[model samples]
Every structure is written in structure tokens, then in C-alpha cells.
Target chain A: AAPESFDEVYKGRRIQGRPAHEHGGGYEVFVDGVQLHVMRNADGSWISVVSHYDPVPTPRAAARAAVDELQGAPLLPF
Target chain B: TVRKNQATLTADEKRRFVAAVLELKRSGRYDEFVRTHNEFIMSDTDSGERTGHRSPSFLPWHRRFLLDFEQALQSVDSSVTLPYWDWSADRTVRASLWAPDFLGGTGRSTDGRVMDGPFAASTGNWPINVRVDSRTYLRRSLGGSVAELPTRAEVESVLAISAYDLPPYNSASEGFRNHLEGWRGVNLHNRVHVWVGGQMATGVSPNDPVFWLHHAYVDKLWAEWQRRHPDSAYVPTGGTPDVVDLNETMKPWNTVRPADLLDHTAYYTFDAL
Candidate 1:
């Protein structure tokens, strides 16, 4: 599927994001509709705003978990 | 504030976060995140004013920094939020998080194009803005460098350590943080970099999603140590120079203190002990 915008309630929290070229529309993450600042690497994984560890295969999943782990802080605007 | 796994959020919240991020990217504000981290990662030495690496503040500093980014994302899209990755459970690439609807799978060798997911370079939506290597598209060769993410046993061994952070306060410290951080022993942080190859090994690693998962696992290990040893806590509590003392404030924000961030419950909850 072509990359698109996301606006849904994941794990009881409001989240949003757009798709990236590497992960289809699965890239990009947001918490409470704030962009979680998802990044893709050569490995096809992702890094989020919270933990910039460095490149993983899955960005969306990590994004989702970041939202969960974030506790409940609304996403920050860069 | 121990957030429960079942906690719920409204759609408005998700939208808020998404909008914030898109705006930043549109306004070129997001690139600074790359620049700032790279600067610290390179400058934050074992001796000088350490910010990211080789200090007890590494975890808290990153924790705060990630929040800053997350907050930035929220400014764009209020409905969005950050999630955590548990490497021990999602050991394989088949985890639901990597599904085509989520972060997608690994990249092909020839071009690093994520055949699936939303950000596959072919789509052209998510570009490699700040990269280290020459190749522009995303690339990942799991187990390509050292093969396999750190196992659970490895994480447990590190968690067993009791000391928080000690003197010397550099990469040479012996404890759960240093061993798993891949600084002292076999090199955890850099090895993962080499594992992904390409720009990942370089300073600009946010290009990959696994970075979050890998770090999430790292963060979890830190949390685990707290559980295993309630008596022990954040080391280098005070009177430390160069390193971020327990009471010392970190950079970027310069408000929140390491002491304030010591409690994981103040931010997140684990998947049960």
C-alpha cells in the first residue's frame, strides 16, 4: 500500500503518523497525535523520538510500543 | 505515574501527535534532532562534558531526549503516542510490529529497499535526510554483522549487577548499564550498528526502526535491574563532575534532573516482571 496518514486509537492512546518509503505506510509514529519522530535506516527498522537507539527492522511496532511506554505524555512538536 | 497496558486514549490525541511531526518535517525543524544527537554522540566523550554516552545520565538523558522528540511529534499530531519494544519477546522479524501495516520487514541486500512497510525508499515519502553512508535508501542485514539480537540470558546476566554507576564514570564502568550498553565488553551499541551495516553503523542510525526496539530492550534491562535490587539505585548520585549527577540537570532541557528520572514508574510500566 502506498504510504498514507494514520489517525487511530492504538492501545487506548491516540496516535498518528505517515508512511515512509522503506516501511510502506508503516513508518512514522505519533503519541496523542504528535509525531513520534520515527526514522528508518538501511536495515528497514525504525527509531522513535524516545529511544534513538539506531535502526531496527520495524518502525511502526516500535512506535506503537513507544506510545505505550511513553506513559501518557502528548507528543512534542518539533 | 505507572501507566497501565490497558490505558486508553482518544482519537484527538493521535491526530495531535501526527500533525506536530509533519509540521516539523515540513518546516525543516526535525533535522535538528539528527544534528543535535550526532553532535553529542561524537562529542560526549569519556573525559569531557559527557551528554549521551559514557555516563550514568546516558539512559536518563536519552529518555528525556526521546521525550523531546516525542513531544515534537505530538505538536504535529495530537492523537499520536510513543510505544516501547520488548526485544526478548519479538526476537524475530515476523513480529506484528514489522507487518506491512506496521514498521515493515528487513531490507533486501542489493538496495536496502524495504519490500514492505510504509517507508520503503521506493515510495519516496520517507527520505534518508541525514545519512552516514553513500547509499540513500534504507538497508538492513540482520545477523549480517554479528547475527542475532542479544539473547535474554545475556540481558539477565547484566541485570543481576547491583551497583548503579560508579566512579571513573566512563565507558569503563562495570555494571548492568555498561555491559549491556555495548561499551566495555563486546560492544553492544556499536556492534548493533555494524550488524545493520550501511548508515546504521555510522553516527546517523535513527534511519532504522530496530534502533527503537534495541534501545527499548536496553531500557527494559535498566528497569529490571531496579526490580532485582530495590536497595541499589542510580549511581554517581552527587559530587560528580563531567558526568550527570543524580541531582544534576541534563542538557537540551536543563530542567528535569536525573534524580527525577530515576523512577521508571514516573514514566512507564513493564510487561510484568
Candidate 2:
């Protein structure tokens, strides 16, 4: 099951996560309006391309980390 | 060619290695490597056409990738070769690996920007070109994201696993490839990435010069495993869908196969076990 949908402003950027159905793309994570590709590990940890190596605990955490790392800069779509 | 332990590098060897890397960055060749890694990391899937990572091919894929990188370095300086970092043995923030003369120390706590080292943005040579964030500089926070590096005992535990890879052939698999890849077991590779934090933690990990040293070490571990279990061998000889079979050629370079890269001696050798 996917984590519950989350929508919140993080680090002054709008971060959102919604359940998705795709390979390596379980849930959609967005930093501001640009979509951040996130994958859910088998252990349920989440990682985004911008912060790939470190797996965070949840989808919202992934989105927020993207926001924090982005530092108000626009995310590049991959 | 002989790959030496980073700790064993003479001052001249270190200078040449750093110079060759900077030349790659200066000539605009380095960023492509970073871009390529990010592309594969974002695209590779456990349930799809997985290559480069999260599949049985992870070992061979990176083997080829590292070879390509080493060849490029040798192109710049004939005397230069990749060096391996045995994190388990040199597991500390204060190790010589992080010294400014080498790869530099940790980034500041405020924004995680590396303020020293040749690669530091202030040096005007190392720019974070293939980036997900706005910052155009390298960053790191050693031992910040994760408290500690994997102990040598932990690495040995993963190394003892017999099977090359198991049923799923991805992160969920319980075997040597998945375990050494750090998707399971004692968590070797992925933990070091997190421990480095910053750009090293991103899919564009090649942006950090340590990316090469780190992968070189992982590649060494693979070789060590081969020596420890001479008969274990790479699995799924053929008919494996979405995963590269032992003889199937990997992507980004279809000319090489796992069978082609099974022997490190053909390309280069470690100075010692």
C-alpha cells in the first residue's frame, strides 16, 4: 500500500506526494510544481533522484528532503 | 595497470590522480558520466528493464562503467589509475581520505557546501553541472546522515554469502549481489553513500570525485568475493527477463557482457587483496 497523500509547503516550496502506479515510481513526489521521481524500497524506505543514496522513512520525507535540498531552486525533470 | 589503496597512494600518485580528474572536469567529459549515472539510476526498476543497478547486472554494469572511467583517466595521464577506498578499514571522518590535499573534508553544517579542496566550487574547476539542486558546488557531511561506516566485520558477513544473486535479482533478493549492493544484509554500498551525504548521496554521484574511489573499492570487494568463493560464479546464465544474463551485454555500452568483465586482471589489478 502507498503512504497517504501529503501536500504541504516545505522550505518555502510546495511539496506534494500522491500514490502512483509505475515501475520504480510507486508514488509521485513534487517539489514546487516540478515532479520529483521517487522510488519506494522493498523495506518501504523512499529515495528521490536528487537524494538517491539516502533512503528516507516516508514519501513525505522524500518530498520534504527534495525541497530542503533544492533550496528554493527549480528541480530539473529527469 | 594496478589499482592501489587510496591510503597507499604516494604524494605524486595523489597529485596525478587529482590532476587527471580535474582535467576530465575541465574538458567537460566528467559531467557526462554524472548525467549517465543519474539517467540510469532514475530509470532502473526492480520490475522492469533494470540495468546499471538493482539487478544482477549491478556488478558487471558498474564494472564496465568504472573501466570506462579509468580508461578516460589514463587517457589524460598514462601513469594514472583508479584507487580504491576501503571504508570499513579507514572508517572515520578524520581519515586521510578527507584531507584537503586529497578529496577534502566534510561540508559545513549550514548548507552542506564543501569549503576546501580542489573540487570545492571556490576553486573554479569543479562545478556541479549535472545537478538536481540549485547549488553549483560539491557538498558532503561525513557521518552526518548515517552515524557510522560499516565495520570490517559487517563487510565480511556480506562477503561470506555464497550465491551470486537469488530469485528476484533485485533489492529484495537475498544473495551476494543484493547484499553487497547494500539493498539488503549489512548494507555496505548504500550506507557509505548516505554517510557521505551531499552530491555523493544523489544519483549524479559521479559529481563527487570520491564516487570513482568509492566504486573502485566496491569493485574490489566483488573481486575479493570471487577469490573467496572461486566456484560461486554470476547467476542466471540465460532466459532471465529484464535482468542481464551472464552472457548478455549491458546497456550504455552493449559491447561488453558480465562474462567479459568477470576477470579484473584483463583490465587492471589490485596492488594487494
Candidate 3:
């Protein structure tokens, strides 16, 4: 099951994730309004292109990891 | 063709390999690989039609992908074969693999730009074209996202698992594929990506040349695992859905099946094997 929706500013970037079953892997994540394609591993952890290999426990954690990984660089859409 | 360890490459061999890679970049053939990988990485999912990664085909998908890239490199230089980096052995920033003449050292503290090496932004030869942001150059904070590379003991632990893969053959499977994929166990392949901590850590990881080398070694480990557990092979012999079946053809290439790639010797052999 997808986690609850989230919309907040972290490290000056607007990050969002919500249950979009029509989107990828039953969830969608966005950084500053750009779609950050996120996928849930079989065990329920989430990973995005920005942090592709390391799986965080939730979609929101995946979003925050992307913010930290971006280090202020704008995330170009996939 | 023999895939030698990157650490053992002669200076001339390294030069030729690097030259062929640069030629691929110069001809704009290399970035296509980056784009393909990004497409599959973003598209592949545990609950969808996953092909390239996070599935049973992860090993064979990359095997074919790397073969395609190696063939392209051979198009430039016949004598050049892809080299494998034994991260468990050559496990430090100070290892010869990171020398100025080779892949180069860790990135500088600020912005994580790789300050040295053939791929340095200042080199004018390598440019970041297919990427996630405005910055246009290679970057790596070696050991930044993760503290250390997997040690030999950790690798041995993954190799000892005898089952090729198990039921629900995705990242969470209990057997060899999921464990070696670094989702279920000690984290072999994925940790190396995070440890590299730049484009190497992202979906467009092929932006860094070490992507090929890293995957080459991962492929080599697949072969090593086969020898250690010859009785076990790729799973889901039939009737699987979403993920690729053992004999089903993988995507992008759409021709080679895991059955076709099960024998590494048919394509290339390792220096050890």
C-alpha cells in the first residue's frame, strides 16, 4: 500500500508524493513540481532516478533523499 | 576475448580502452546508452513489466546491454575488451584504479565535481550531455553517499547463496538474484553505485565510464556464482507474469533471452575463468 500524501518544503525545494496508482509503481514523487519517477521495491521501499539504487522506507523518504542528493541542482525531468 | 581486471590493465591497454570510450562519446553513441538505461531504470518496477533492473532479468538484461556496448567499443578498437573492477579487492580511493591516468580520484568537496581523470569537465573531451540537471560534467564523491565499498567477506557471503532466484522474483526475493542485486542482503551491486555517489549513483549512471566497468564486474560475479552453484540456474522456467521468464526475450534488445545469456563463455571469458 502507498503511504499518505505529502507536500512540504525541504532544503528550499518543494517535494511531493502521493498515491497515483495510474503512475509508476502505484506512487508518484515530485521535486519542485517536476515528476520524479519513483518505484517501490517488492518489500515496500521506494527509489527514484535521483537516488536510484538505495531504497528508502517510504515515498516521502525517497523525496527527501532526492532533495539531499540534488544539493541545490535543479532536477531535470525524466 | 578476455575481460581482465581493471587493476591489471597495462598502461597501453588502459589508453586504448579509454580512447575507444572517448570515441564512443565523441561520436555521440555513448549517451544513447545513458538514455536507454535511464528509460529502463525509471520504467522498470516491481509490480509492472520490469525488464532491465529489479527483476529476474536484471543479470541477463545487463549482460546483453554490456555486450552491445562492448561491441560498439570493438567497433573502434578490436583489441580492447571491457575490464572488471574487483571492488572487494581494490577497495580504496588510493587504489591504482583511481590514479590520475586511469579513472581518477574522488571528487572535490564542493559540488562533488571530479577534479582529476580523463572524464574531468576541464578536459574538454568529456561532456555531460544526457543528465538530470543543468550541470554538464562528470561528478563523483567516491565513498560519499556510502561509507565503504563491500569487502571481500561480504561478497563471499552473497556468492554462497545457491539458488539463482526464488518465487516473486523481484528485488525482495529471498535467493541469489535479490541478494546480489543488493536489495535483500548484504548489498553487493547497489552499494557500489551509492558509494560512487555522482552520476554513477543515478539512473543515468552510464554518464560515467566506470558504469561499464562496474557492471562488467557484476556480470563477472554472475559467472562466478554459476560456477559455485552450477546445479541452480535462472528461475521461473515458465508461467510467470510481469517479470521476464527464464527463456523469455528481454526488452530493448528484445531478442536475447536469459537462456541465451546463461553461459558467459559463449560471449567472453574472465581472466580467472
Candidate 4:
């Protein structure tokens, strides 16, 4: 049971990306079709867990970026 | 040489640094530097979908950001440079860096109002602008926040970590970056923020003069880290999909990338590391 791919419609748009690593349970982000690791913190602020320096505007965008990063991996194992 | 190294400044050199800083305050230009830093630090966090802090990019991001501040200081006084505070060595609030002439001493016990330092609200030179509290002025009740600064031994231990920044490069990673960022653990940034109290510890931290020295020390630790682990360089280097690659341009200043900032030789030099 390796990590799955996120390939469902989320927030009214098709979101896609690799499933979270074996440890952390969060997906990476992709925009349009580019990898962007969106990290949600305890304080509610989301960050690209990968870059973690630039601030984006919304979670949907974060999700989109995760989708793009996913490229075309299969859905994660439920 | 002190001007070039930024690390070799002597007591005398520090005097010059202090005088120059004072002059900037006198000219009404110093507080602007504080404003600039606070703007970036507060907004540069991971929230909702936007991530400003908590990634491999954090290092280079701040490296370039500090340069903007140093350059601003240079503009005010060419002889002035950002002095690195080896908190590991100068661990106490009693260090010469905090002298009334240099940055200023701690705040009064009653209200945490800084009675020394050039930015002390008493001088009528430095004022608290971007703040959240009611009593607006420079304040610092040392030991008020946590009652202690990270000792040299403690800082040395962190510098000893070999992994520049392990993956999952978010704030949650090992409580390591958070300790370094001063939010959790020993609290590097937050403690200084608390030591400076008043506006500095809050959303308007840059309003205090100590902000520069505090950050300078933080920057020094980065340089030290580079020396400790030459192999573990900045992460998300090339193919960390979605992540801003080293060569990729950063926001705010879209012209530069983490790659452009990997080397600090263009702007500053370290002591021995």
C-alpha cells in the first residue's frame, strides 16, 4: 500500500498530487499541473511545505499546486 | 576590514556602529528599517494556502531580506554595517551590544519600557508605530519573556546539527526550525522579541533597535551552519516538484532566486566559519 494520488474534484476544481508520505498525512500541491507542496499549520496558515517561504492566497490554489506536483500519480490507497 | 567582515568589529568599532545608528534615528530614517523587517517577518508565515515561513527556502529568503535591511543601513551611514551578535558568546543582556550607547540596555521592570538604548522611548528619537499594545514606545524587560537567553552552549548544540534542513521542510518538522525561528523550544526569535518586549515581540517587532542585532545574530547562525555541514546545502535544490527550486525566483523581489543568494560573500563575510 504505497501512497496514493489525489485525483478528485476538490473545492469545485479537479485537484491532483501525490499522497502524503508514509508519516505525514497531507498531500503535496500543484497548480494547473505543477508541484506545490501546501502545508497547513496549527495556526491555520498554509504554506508550501516544500518552499515554505512564499505566502499564497488560498487553500484551493494550494490544492491546485499539489495537484500539479502530483503530475499523474494514481489515487492514494484509502 | 571590520567594515567588510561584519564579524571582527571591536569595542571601538561597535562604538562607531552605535553612533551611526543613533544618527540614523536622529534623521528619522531608523524606524523605517524596523518597519521593513516587521512587514516581512509577520507576513512571511504559512497560513491558509500561502506559505512564507517553514520551508527550505526560509534560509535564502531571510538571507536576501537581511541584505535589503543592511543596504538600507548603509545608505544611512556608509561606515555602518550590520554587526553580527554571536549570541552563543554574548549570551547575556549584559553584552556590550546592549549598552546604552550601542543598542541600549533592558526595559524597566514596571512597564518593560526600555530606559537605555538609542530607541528608548525616552530619547524622543525612536517611536513605536506599527504596534498592537497600548503603551507605544521602545520597551525591553530582559528575562521578562523567558528569563533567559539561549546560552552559548545551547546555540552551539543547534549549530552542530548536520542536516541543513531535513525534508517535510515545513514548520512541523522536528521543532528544530521552530527552535531556530524562536517560536518553540528555546525560542531564538521570539525570545529576542520578548526581550525587546513592547512592539518588537508583537506584530510590530521591527520598531525596536534590538531587532537588527537580534536578526544579525540569527543570520550569523546560518553562516555557522554552512560551515558545520558543507555537504548539506539548501534543500529543494533542483527537482523538488512544486517547491520553489534553488534557482527559481522568490516573490516580492521576483528578480532573484535562492541560488543567487546561496553565497553571502557578495554582501558579508563571516568571522572564521
> Could you give me the TM-score of model 1 versus the true structure?
0.67
lDDT of 2 by residue, A1-78 (tens): 778998988778888888872245767888877888888776678888877877789989888877776656788766
Q: Per-residue lDDT tens digits of candidate 1, residues B154-220?
A: 6667777788776777666787667766665545555665555434554556655445445654665
**lDDT agreement of model 1 with the native:** 0.60
Task: Label model 4 with its docking quality class.
Answer: incorrect
Provide the overall lDDT of each model, using Cα atoms, as 2-decimal numbers. 0.60, 0.87, 0.88, 0.57
What lDDT is reached at residue A20 by model 4? 57
For residues B1-273, what per-residue lDDT tens digits would candidate 3 score against the true structure? 999999999999999999999999999999999999888887877777778877889999999999999999999999999999999999999998888888888888888888888989899988999987767878899888889899989988999998888877877788888888888878999999999988899888999899999999999999989999889989889889888898888888777789999998999999995
lDDT (tens digit, per residue) of candidate 2 on B83-192? 99999999998888898889999998888889898888899999888887667889898998789999989989988999999978888999999988898767999999
- Which window of ten consecutive residues has the lowest lDDT sum in model 1 chain B? B1-10
Q: Which is the leading candidate under TM-score? A: 3
Q: What TM-score is obtained for chain B in each of the predicted models? A: 0.83, 0.99, 0.98, 0.83
The TM-scores, one per candidate, come to: 0.67, 0.96, 0.97, 0.69
TM-score, candidate number 3: 0.97
Q: Write the per-residue lDDT of candidate 4 for residues B1-273, one digit (tens) a residue.
A: 132233356677667766677677667776666555444443443322112345666667767766776776677667677766665566577777677667777777666677876667887766665443235567665665456677776777777666665555655555344457653355565565555444554444556656666676776677777777777776667766444577888766789888787677777775555
* Candidate 2: chain B TM-score against the reference chain B: 0.99
